[PDB]
Every structure is written in C-alpha cells, then in structure tokens.
Design a protein around this ligand. Structure first.
Ligand SMILES: O=c1[nH]c(=O)c2[nH]c(=O)[nH]c2[nH]1
Ligand SMILES: O=c1[nH]c(=O)c2[nH]c(=O)[nH]c2[nH]1
Lengths: 162, 162
C-alpha cells in the first residue's frame, strides 16, 4: 500500500456512508505531479529559472527562428496553462530574456521575442531538462511507462473535451 | 494527436540532435494535473476554500475525533506535500477553522485542532468534493481508469523511493 491507500482507509473509517474511491486516481495524479515538479525544478534552479519561466522560454524556442510569438500563440503552445501572463511576461522582460517588439502588421499590438540571452539559456536548459526527465522515468519498466503515457493521454482527452 | 504531441513535433524540428521523448509522459502528467486542479477548485470555491485549505481540513477530519493532530502528523498525512506550513496554518487559525492548543505532554509544543466551524465545513465540502471527482472521472472507461490508477501507483512508488 501507499500513502493514498492509507488516506482511502481513513475515509473508510471516518465516513463509511460515503464512497471516496474517486479520491484514489486523482490523489495519486496530483501527488505524483507535485513530486515530479520538485525533481524538475531541482534542475531548473541551476539556471535561475522557475517552472513557468522554463515553459515560456521553451515555448518561444519551439516556435523556431526568429523565436517570436504573439501572446495568444504563446499561451496556446505552453506545456501547461495557467492564469494571466501580464506579470510573468513583465518579469522575463526585466531579466532580459524576452523583449516586447511592436507588431509590424498592427502598431497597437505587441509581440514576444526571445532575446539572444534567453536563447542561449533555454538551449542549455532544455538539454539538461531532457536528461533529467530521462533519469526520473528510468526507474519504471518500459511497458509500465508506455501504458501510463497512453492512459494519461486518455485522461487529458476528457479533461480538455470539457 | 494532442497538444503534447504537437510540442514533441516542435522539438523534432527545432532540436533534431536531441531526443525529447521523456517530455511526453511528464508533460501529460503535469498538464492533466493542472486541468484537474481547475475542476477541483471550481467545487472548493463554493466553500471559500483553496486546494491546500481543503487538504489540511480533510487531513484533520481523517484523523478521527477529536480531530487533533500534531504538525508532524498533519504534514505526513496530507494528500500532497508542499513547503512550510507556518503561514498556511496561521491563516486557517484566523478564519476560525483550526485552533492551536498546547500539548498536554509537552508545554513547549503545540497541536492543531479542527474547530467546530471547520468540522461542519469540511464534512459538507468532502461530500461535494467526492461527487465532483466522480463526475470528472465518469467520462473515462472503467478499464482505462483502473489501469491509469495502477500505473500512477507505480510512478508514485519510484518518485517516493528517491
Ligand atoms: O517544450 C517544453 N518541454 C517541456 O518539458 C516543458 N515543460 C514545461 O513546463 N514547459 C515545457 N516545454
Ligand atoms: O482526504 C483527502 N481527499 C482528497 O481528495 C484530497 N485532496 C487534497 O488535496 N487533500 C485531500 N484529502
């Protein structure tokens, strides 16, 4: 048994009138995601990056040269969505990783361009990030990791179809 | 394909020298967990509770009457771990949901006791939370949800064994 089985056993004792079985899968998902985040940010911290900072920089990098995206395009291609980007983009601009250039097709619009400093940083960070993620998943059998990847895609399909 | 497949395809184009396949399973895990959190907090908000507030209250509730736990016991039985509990416990005390009583076995120690207000709140919140989680998972086939639950337990086993 694990810590989520112990929690389900606590609810079998405290609220026997309720069926708390849906807590199982969701609890393990959220518990794994928090522990996974600690493993990832232990690598991101070597570059003075948070998780959202790496996400925004890697998203601009994935767009290809000249690594310039609109805020709408940037938001839609992030690995994980979140709240507004106003303050997060403002901090990345202060650190010199991104610059807000004026859209040539609309003067009253702005575009997000990865600077040459953020480009050199994100190219080094993505290399260490990939190797770090490989070490984390390395402890699982290949058949289990492939099944978890497929079952997570099924869960993601239902969440985004909502 | 999904949004994580599109990201993996972006890395196949931008860094063909790198193998970014470990990004797949971890990206879907973190993407699902964020979308799952939005579905959960859409129910927690009806009770003026955040995710960590529900976690701490449900943990004290799971301990059984008189719903009194030490900070070490409280931390070890939370669904998801996090940083320090100093400020989070201080806010719950201001809202009247918990009170810090003195340990009778150690005067220089404190215990966390769920008040009668937090007890009535968490008993109503856990009922709606369980029904909410059932509706979220209801869209998946039974065989897929059971396999995802087992594969997540395998992932959790490796993360906590680290
Ligand atoms: O291209 C990315 N790969 C990731 O693994 C990742 N993780 C994250 O948060 N953003 C991104 N972006
Ligand atoms: O008993 C709990 N069930 C949960 O589903 C849950 N989720 C959470 O964050 N804390 C808790 N506690």
């Amino acid at each position: 048994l694990d810590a989520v089985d112990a929690i389900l056993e606590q609810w079998r004792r405290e609220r026997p009138d309720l069926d708390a079985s849906p807590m199982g899968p969701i609890g393990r998902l959220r518990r794994c995601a928090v522990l996974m985040d600690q493993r990832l940010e232990s690598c991101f911290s070597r570059f003075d990056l948070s998780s959202w900072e790496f996400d925004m920089l890697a998203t601009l990098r994935r767009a290809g040269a000249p690594h310039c995206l609109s805020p709408t395009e940037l938001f839609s291609t992030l690995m994980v969505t979140s709240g507004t980007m106003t303050h997060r983009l403002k901090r990345l601009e202060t650190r010199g990783f991104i610059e807000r250039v004026q859209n040539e097709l609309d003067a009253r619009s702005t575009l997000v361009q990865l600077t040459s400093s953020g480009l050199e940083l994100i190219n080094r960070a993505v290399e260490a990030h990939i190797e770090n993620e490989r070490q984390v998943l390395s402890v699982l059998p290949a058949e289990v990791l492939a099944a978890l990847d497929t079952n997570l895609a099924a869960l993601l399909r239902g969440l985004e179809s909502h």
